[PDB]
């Protein structure tokens, strides 16, 4: 490059930022996803489709692990997702080289959102088009956080993103209670993902990852075929 470095995101005359609001529009028209925190573990459930019978499902993965106990899904766009995965992978290593201890889940999200915000103020680039759902069972209590293209973190009990997320939002508002078990959380997570799905819900149309206090665990399609018997 040359030395331009001019930020292409400035304030509106109203006083809002324009490109971040447009980046949120790309997230809302993405694949639906749901995450539920249920007092012994946290369950991530995304919704994976294939436009043909020609694609392969053992290749592209949505639920992606980070350390040994920290999972991560998204709802926005695809190529930008893999960037900040590899960024967060290295970002958890400088914690572990220095402190010799697995990084707490709150400590990642402070660092990932700091990457993402500082990315928007600098010049020549667009913001990301990805929102995240990060979870983990650190120090007894499990956790569930959500980031955004603006770079703001939250702490949900149960949220949803992607298409028709407000419909899934009201559904969890009646479905979720003070506490459940892990298996009940999986049963209501498939229930809310079956809200806006299509007719074929096989072991390949959904893709589910959990966080035990024993650790992160990604579910193979065998159990998801077995657990979808009398689903929702």
């Amino acid at each position: 490059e040359r030395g331009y470095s001019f930020s292409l995101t400035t304030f509106s005359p109203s006083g809002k930022l324009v490109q971040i609001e447009y980046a949120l529009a790309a997230v809302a028209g993405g694949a639906p996803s749901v995450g539920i925190k249920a007092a012994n573990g946290v369950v991530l459930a995304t919704e994976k489709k294939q436009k043909s019978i020609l694609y392969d499902e053992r290749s592209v993965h949505k639920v992606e692990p980070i350390t040994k106990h920290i999972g991560l899904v998204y709802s926005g766009m695809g190529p930008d997702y893999r960037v900040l995965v590899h960024r967060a992978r290295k970002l958890a290593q400088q914690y572990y080289l220095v402190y010799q201890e697995p990084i707490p889940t709150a400590q990642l999200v402070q660092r990932v959102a700091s990457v993402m915000q500082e990315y928007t103020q600098s010049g020549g680039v667009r913001p990301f088009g990805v929102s995240l759902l990060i979870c983990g069972w650190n120090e007894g209590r499990p956790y569930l956080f959500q980031s955004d293209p603006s770079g703001a973190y939250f702490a949900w009990k149960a949220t949803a993103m992607g298409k028709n997320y407000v419909n899934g939002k009201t559904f969890l508002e009646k479905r979720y209670n003070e506490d459940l078990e892990l298996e009940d959380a999986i049963h209501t997570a498939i229930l809310t993902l079956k809200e806006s799905f299509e007719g074929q819900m096989t072991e390949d149309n959904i893709e589910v990852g959990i966080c035990n206090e024993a650790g992160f665990r990604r579910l193979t399609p065998t159990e998801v075929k077995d657990y979808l018997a009398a689903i929702a």
């Binding site: 692990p65 590899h86 992978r89 290295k90 290593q93 572990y96 080289l97 010799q100």
Partner: protein, 220 residues
Amino acid sequence: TTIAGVVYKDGIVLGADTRATEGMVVADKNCSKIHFISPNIYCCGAGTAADTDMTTQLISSNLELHSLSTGRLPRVVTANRMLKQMLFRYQGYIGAALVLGGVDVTGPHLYSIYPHGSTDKLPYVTMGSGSLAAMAVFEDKFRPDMEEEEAKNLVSEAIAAGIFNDLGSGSNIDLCVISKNKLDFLRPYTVPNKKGTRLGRYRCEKGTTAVLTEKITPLE
């Protein structure tokens, strides 16, 4: 410091003592010199203490980073290639005499790494101060394709020769067996040397020490 390692018909047996001397004074009666790299690869270190620590944590970081990206399994030749390329870059100013061993998809592999960067692929290696004593037991007693109990008897014999015939090795024996599926890690394996008991009460009554100024600060 005395480390060794051998390849039997299925897996790999590693072994070390537990003693870190500082000059000519025993600074640690129980150290830990078998390090983690991956769920199928361990490593043993010798020479400088801190330089083997910070190196073997860096490579265990990168292979965890690599294998989580590929999603398959680490390989021992990858751990060999990262180490010899790093140590050669620092011109041998980092004292790290390693023994690398693990079981891949291909099979068991054993490596000796010198701190200038030269590496070897051997069926049995010894490093450290009491390495010349340990190589005497390996060469007099070795056959290809041993059993697991034959190998575990052999390495503990070689480490015990390093203890009883050298001043840098003086304590408990560690082992580690890495087969194709089983990972055994035995920190007390053999205690050859005890400590003699005390025959005299030396404790005086409480208040046998003159105190100038005391101070109490309560906590929560």
